[PDB]
Amino acid sequence: EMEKEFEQIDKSGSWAAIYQDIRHEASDFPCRVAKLPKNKNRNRYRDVSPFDHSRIKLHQEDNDYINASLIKMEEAQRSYILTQGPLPNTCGHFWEMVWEQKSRGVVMLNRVMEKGSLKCAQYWPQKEEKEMIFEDTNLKLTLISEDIKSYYTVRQLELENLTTQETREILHFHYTTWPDFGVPESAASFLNFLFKVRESGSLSPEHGPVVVHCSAGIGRSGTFCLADTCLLLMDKRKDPSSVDIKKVLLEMRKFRMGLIQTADQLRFSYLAVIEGAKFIMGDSSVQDQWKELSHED
């Protein structure tokens, strides 16, 4: 089991070595479009790029590049789009991607300002009466409502294709207490938030893939997706023992580089999946225990 392995890695304190082995075996595919000169100002970080084979293409003829990867989990039957925190010049591209991919939810794992630096553009409206128009992609974005909890906020947004006047409801799930290169405060807090996203419909197959991002879109974003996919695999079989976390993470890293950025994020992933297994294997009451322990009030 993952719990035995977990205890076999703590004992020997070999989380650094396990995680480094993940880094050494991880896929290496080209990111030639990302590195084209004309795309320099569409990338937030030099060293975080989408692979060409899995990148999201915008449906525009000018320049279809966005720093975003489709993570398609075949066995689990769930897809995610992982992207960087939009730049001041890519907020129109970001919402264009949400529209064209038919996403219902956006999961944001970072704060706009972290450790005194701007990590992400303010790409959604903070006030109902102050809507946003992205002139380049011809899209309108209105804040419809907000539900502020102690460590996360859920927003209902209305996204409108101004060309066709069609409108969609987008749910924005904003985790505000997860430090960059850090871990959530508890398994319970993380799982309470993940199950909030799940319960919204945003991850369901009748919608486009959920969009998940932090500043770079690999560390916190990878931790979130890895936990969700592992729990889903366990769910399909009701067989916690058939789930190999390291193998799942390596499969995900075929679609975007760098997923999970520290050995303690890897270790936290194990914690989250082990705890979440209690719900999957039949203990429904544990979901209310997470909500209490997370102190969202």
Ligand code: VO4
């Ligand atoms: O470019 V792919 O055939 O790996 O979706």
Ligand code: VO4
């Ligand atoms: O914004 V991250 O360093 O959690 O990919």
